[PDB]
Design an enzyme around this catalytic site. Structure first.
Site, PDB file in Angstrom:
ATOM      1  N   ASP A  40       0.879  -0.990  -0.035  1.00 20.52           N
ATOM      2  CA  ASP A  40       0.122   0.070  -0.155  1.00 20.52           C
ATOM      3  C   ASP A  40       0.739   1.204  -0.017  1.00 20.52           C
ATOM      4  O   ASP A  40       2.024   1.377   0.172  1.00 20.52           O
ATOM      5  CB  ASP A  40      -0.998   0.081   1.060  1.00 20.52           C
ATOM      6  CG  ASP A  40      -2.066   1.059   1.353  1.00 20.52           C
ATOM      7  OD1 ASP A  40      -2.283   1.612   0.088  1.00 20.52           O
ATOM      8  OD2 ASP A  40      -2.772   1.021   2.063  1.00 20.52           O
ATOM      9  N   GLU A  52       3.019   5.410  -3.356  1.00 17.36           N
ATOM     10  CA  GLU A  52       3.393   6.733  -4.335  1.00 17.36           C
ATOM     11  C   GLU A  52       4.715   7.427  -4.275  1.00 17.36           C
ATOM     12  O   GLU A  52       5.279   7.612  -5.186  1.00 17.36           O
ATOM     13  CB  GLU A  52       2.407   7.836  -3.839  1.00 17.36           C
ATOM     14  CG  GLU A  52       0.677   7.496  -4.452  1.00 17.36           C
ATOM     15  CD  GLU A  52       0.107   6.663  -3.569  1.00 17.36           C
ATOM     16  OE1 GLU A  52      -0.770   5.882  -4.004  1.00 17.36           O
ATOM     17  OE2 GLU A  52       0.679   6.452  -2.320  1.00 17.36           O
ATOM     18  N   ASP A  83      -8.055   5.214  -2.951  1.00 18.29           N
ATOM     19  CA  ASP A  83      -9.193   5.481  -2.040  1.00 18.29           C
ATOM     20  C   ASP A  83     -10.527   6.514  -2.808  1.00 18.29           C
ATOM     21  O   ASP A  83     -10.436   7.545  -2.442  1.00 18.29           O
ATOM     22  CB  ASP A  83      -8.730   6.094  -0.825  1.00 18.29           C
ATOM     23  CG  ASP A  83      -7.771   5.208  -0.108  1.00 18.29           C
ATOM     24  OD1 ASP A  83      -7.987   3.992  -0.267  1.00 18.29           O
ATOM     25  OD2 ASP A  83      -6.720   5.774   0.712  1.00 18.29           O
TER      26      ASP A  83
HETATM   27  O1  LIG Z   1      -7.166   0.626   0.880  1.00 18.41           O
HETATM   28  C1  LIG Z   1      -6.811   1.339   1.797  1.00 18.41           C
HETATM   29  C2  LIG Z   1      -5.659   2.155   1.215  1.00 18.41           C
HETATM   30  O2  LIG Z   1      -6.013   2.709  -0.011  1.00 18.41           O
HETATM   31  C3  LIG Z   1      -5.068   3.041   2.234  1.00 18.41           C
HETATM   32  O3  LIG Z   1      -5.835   4.010   2.639  1.00 18.41           O
HETATM   33  O4  LIG Z   1      -4.721   2.058   3.561  1.00 18.41           O
HETATM   34  C4  LIG Z   1      -5.649   1.430   3.979  1.00 18.41           C
HETATM   35  C5  LIG Z   1      -6.562   0.839   2.945  1.00 18.41           C
HETATM   36  O5  LIG Z   1      -7.677   0.216   3.557  1.00 18.41           O
END
Ligand SMILES: O[C@@H]1[C@@H](O)[C@@H](O)OC[C@H]1O
Ligand SMILES: [K+]
Length: 919
Positions: free
Chosen positions: A526, A529, A602
């Site tokens: 995750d 970026e 998100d």
């Molecule tokens: O998908 C989400 C991700 O994009 C980030 O926000 O960390 C939490 C996860 O639930």
């Protein structure tokens, strides 16, 4: 004119024209490099992999030109200014640079001298352009659009572009990059005259309120609360941090342009934002406060006349907004195809000749690597949550899917399973996760896989941070300024530097000891970026991610996920022989070669966001990444949904149901999001049409798995895609070039998701040249028409192209549940068709050594005969002898679309050719 084994270099005679070099990568792939210094020295490419192709070519010299000719392409170079023109094997022109169309400008940053580079190409009005990543404006066709590549949560950069004129372009640059206007979005007053709500020139009228109570008014010459550094100008008197207090700001006035033509704008905003121009609503949007994004519009405006603007912002602390503007380019460059990059050493791009859109994507895979096969279970249903707060909650969810006999393959553990002050340790909080080893075993015992979140983020108090920092691989600035994250009281934190192989080794070793040793199946990588601290301005994002092991974050702004995922892929693959799966929040040029799937980030629980993902997914596929998904239902929700207000429960249920139907027909099928819970029975109880629908599509996916996985095999075998824009298969139909809410799921299924609350039908355009069969009825529709397709709440419009052969199986609660399942081949008649069915063990890398099978399926419409050809290839666990059922859909049929439909014939197959006649 300098000849080489693989191309030529021309030093043009005109003063100022940069030397240019052409290299033949393959018969249909030509590299173009232009460098004022004539050395063509650049930082080693990160996206490129080696290609061994046919590098043969012949050179001719006309008067003003040098020409390179392969078997597929003739490339002409002007000896006067070096501009390059491409023509195909038959001499037909395909693509030409603008003569004198290169730009190089100095950029002195981070102790180095870079060039901001720009290349202009001639582009006709009827050229369509696709790709360049995955974006959030809902644009299918990118022709005439301004698109900036800047890795963000919901906005993904991949610098590969495909054109309707039968070519593709790889732009090998890792910095912030712009298609169209090379200047990017301007502050409002830069090329506009402002007048406030009382006609006084110079500003607009800003009114601030708290909970509907006016606080103050003032003139403002810009609408700019875009980033954290901009928030210091918000009136302190107008700020409330009360738990359930909201703020409001309005801007009101008039604007006037200085140059006439098409003006583009962006309302960058989080929370609720409306914008009226001349009293007409132009933007009406909501996003969660910490993830604003661009919402672009355009207007034809002429100088001399004023136009009213009204912005209405309803927000919470903190939120962000900005109104930005681009004025028309000069006429001499306004119609060009333009590519610009902030930092590099030269212009460096690849021309890919493509007889089809498929061949364009294949050239990207040649240049940046084949798409690694993912595990077969990755194409089943995924259930996730933000977040399962204990292992009992996570295991309970899998058990409830099993109790209801719903199809489920994969379960996901989100963030915050670690002790609160120990992000980056990869430890588990024993209060909520007392037996992580037993959690994983319990999931495996229920025939499911489990993926776990792993960030690039570490707290400075952890052993793992100090190992990385001591070796030089922790970015230092975010901890030096003391920036606090959002967890509890707030914790200092930073992100690591993945560019060095030594950093990747440390990062993976920590994960291997703490997590891989417990049996986790997949890695949710995750925030790569990287999202060091949300909503920083770009200067601070750069400063907190630099220097890296190769150079500055200015030169390498968009490339972070590539080495970051590479390290985990290499480590996981060296640990055991199972196929790797990674879900990365950002892809990039080349990330498909490290077994990386991506998702759109998100996004929010809004009908507009759902519709936007359709064009996002098509352009993602044409950019070259074939394994893509999103959060079914959206990630962040409004307070009316979070608080479960009964007045908005019907829309909540309808949105998630419509979005679930959509998600069942994208490459990876995955449910996720913030509260409310997203499991099928938690969306709506059994007995509602929402549960009936989600259950149907959940099980239909498992029946379609032989079809879906065959496409997966061909992402590697034939460098193919899964989610297909309608222009890929109908490139001669102009009506499909701009449609932004239809696509093809493989070659057979036309998908038209419903994105309006209360709709029981929608317009669907059927492409010309084929007839189409409605999946739910068998009704036949001829191509080249728009129809009002029936779409009750429980069903999404779905049509099958005549001549489609669709291999299917029985409904399965998980992959390979029924051993030696019968295969049902469904033929949708109306034209000739063929489908080479790919199969392998779905678990290891034996396919790399040829451990896979292909069974040819050929349908002849005139003879009404389905030919099942000779099998080729074998693999561990293949069914040497197997049952094959056949089903013919040639028109309306009562059980059309049934999960267990009637079969019309059945044979035993042993690899030798066999024929089945419809009669
Ligand atoms: O998908 C989400 C991700 O994009 C980030 O926000 O960390 C939490 C996860 O639930
Ligand atoms: K492995």
């Amino acid at each position: 004119v300098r000849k080489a084994a693989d191309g030529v270099t021309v030093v043009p005679s005109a003063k100022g024209a940069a030397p240019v070099r052409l290299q033949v990568v393959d018969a249909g792939i030509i590299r173009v490099s232009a460098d004022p210094d004539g050395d063509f020295a650049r930082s080693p490419s990160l996206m490129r992999v080696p290609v061994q192709g046919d590098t043969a070519f012949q050179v001719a010299e006309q008067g003003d030109s040098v020409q390179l000719k392969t078997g597929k392409v003739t490339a002409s170079i002007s000896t006067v200014d070096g501009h390059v023109s491409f023509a195909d094997a038959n001499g037909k022109p395909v693509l030409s640079e603008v003569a004198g169309g290169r730009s190089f400008a100095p950029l002195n940053v981070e102790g180095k001298q870079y060039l901001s580079v720009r290349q202009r190409f001639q582009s006709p009005d009827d050229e369509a352009l696709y790709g360049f990543g995955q974006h959030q404006q809902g644009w299918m066709n990118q022709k005439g659009r301004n698109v900036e590549l800047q890795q963000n949560n919901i906005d993904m950069a991949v610098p590969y572009l495909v054109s309707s004129r039968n070519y593709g372009l790889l732009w090998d640059n890792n910095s912030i990059t712009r298609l169209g206007d090379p200047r990017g979005l301007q502050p409002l007053p830069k090329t506009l005259t402002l007048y406030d709500a009382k006609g006084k020139a110079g500003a607009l009228t800003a009114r601030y309120a708290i909970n509907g109570k006016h606080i103050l008014e003032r003139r403002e010459s810009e609408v700019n609360y875009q980033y954290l550094s901009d928030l210091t100008k918000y009136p302190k008197k107008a700020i409330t941090k009360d738990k359930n207090s909201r703020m409001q700001v309005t801007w009101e006035g008039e604007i006037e342009v200085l140059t006439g033509g098409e003006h583009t704008f962006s309302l960058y905003s989080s929370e609720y934002a409306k914008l009226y121009v001349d009293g007409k609503l132009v933007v009406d949007r909501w996003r969660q406060n910490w993830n604003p994004w661009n919402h672009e519009f355009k207007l034809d405006l002429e100088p001399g006349q004023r136009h009213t603007v009204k912005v209405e912002w309803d927000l919470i602390d903190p939120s962000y907004i900005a109104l930005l503007h681009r004025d028309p380019l000069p006429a001499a460059e306004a119609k060009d195809l333009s590519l610009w990059s902030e930092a590099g050493q030269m212009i460096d791009y690849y021309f890919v000749s493509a007889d089809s859109y498929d061949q364009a994507v294949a050239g990207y895979r040649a240049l940046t690597g084949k798409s690694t096969m993912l595990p077969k279970w990755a194409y089943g249903f995924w259930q996730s949550r933000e977040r399962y707060k204990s292992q009992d909650e996570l295991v309970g969810a899998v058990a409830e899917y099993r109790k209801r006999k719903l199809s489920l393959d994969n379960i996901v553990l989100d963030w915050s399973y670690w002790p609160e002050n120990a992000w980056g340790s990869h430890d588990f909080d024993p209060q909520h996760f007392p037996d992580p080893d037993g959690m994983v075993k319990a999931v495996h015992d229920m025939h499911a896989q489990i993926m776990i979140s792993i960030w690039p983020k570490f707290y400075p108090t952890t052993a793992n941070y100090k190992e990385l920092d001591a070796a030089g691989f922790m970015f230092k600035r975010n901890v030096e300024v003391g920036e606090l994250d959002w967890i509890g009281k707030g914790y200092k934190n930073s992100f690591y530097d993945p560019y060095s192989e030594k950093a990747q080794a440390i990062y993976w070793r920590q994960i291997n000891e703490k997590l891989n040793s417990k049996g986790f199946d997949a890695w949710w990588m995750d925030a790569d970026e990287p999202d060091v601290h949300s909503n920083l301005d770009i200067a601070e994002r750069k400063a907190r991610t630099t220097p890296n092991a190769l150079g500055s974050s200015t030169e390498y702004f968009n490339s972070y996920p590539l080495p970051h995922t590479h390290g985990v892929y290499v480590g996981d693959r060296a640990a055991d022989d199972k196929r790797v799966f990674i879900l990365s929040r950002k892809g990039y040029a080349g990330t498909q070669r490290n077994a990386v799937a991506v998702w759109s980030g998100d996004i929010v629980s809004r009908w507009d966001d759902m519709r936007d993902q359709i064009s996002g997914g098509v352009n993602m596929a044409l950019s070259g990444l074939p394994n893509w998904t999103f959060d079914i239902g959206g990630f962040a929700v409004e307070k009316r949904y979070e608080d479960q207000d009964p007045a908005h429960l019907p829309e909540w249920r309808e949105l998630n149901t419509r979005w679930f139907q959509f998600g069942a027909f994208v490459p990876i099928f995955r449910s996720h999001g913030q509260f409310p819970y997203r499991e099928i029975w938690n969306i709506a109880p059994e007995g509602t049409p929402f549960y009936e629908s989600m259950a149907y599509y959940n099980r239909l996916r498992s029946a379609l798995l032989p079809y879906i996985y065959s496409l997966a095999g061909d992402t590697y075998q034939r460098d193919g895609v899964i989610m297909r824009g309608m222009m890929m298969d109908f490139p001669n139909d102009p009506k499909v070039r701009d449609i932004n809410d239809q696509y093809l799921f493989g070659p057979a299924f036309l998908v038209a998701p419903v994105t309006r609350f209360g709709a029981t039908s929608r317009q669907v355009y059927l492409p010309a040249g084929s007839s189409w069969l409605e999946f739910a009825t068998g009704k036949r529709y001829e191509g080249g028409q728009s129809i009002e397709a029936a779409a009750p709440i429980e069903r999404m419009p779905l049509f099958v192209r005549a001549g489609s052969i669709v291999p299917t199986g029985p409904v399965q609660e998980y992959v390979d549940q029924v051993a030696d399942a019968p295969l049902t081949v469904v033929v949708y008649t109306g034209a000739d068709g063929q489908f080479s069915l790919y199969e392998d063990d779905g678990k290891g890398y034996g396919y790399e050594k040829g451990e896979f099978s292909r069974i040819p399926l050929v349908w002849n419409q005139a003879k009404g005969e389905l030919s099942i050809g000779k099998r080729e290839g074998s693999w561990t666990g293949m069914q040497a002898k197997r049952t094959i059922n056949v089903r013919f859909v040639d028109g309306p049929r009562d059980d059309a679309g049934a999960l267990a439909p009637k079969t019309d014939a059945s044979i035993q197959y042993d690899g030798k050719p066999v024929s089945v006649l419809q009669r």
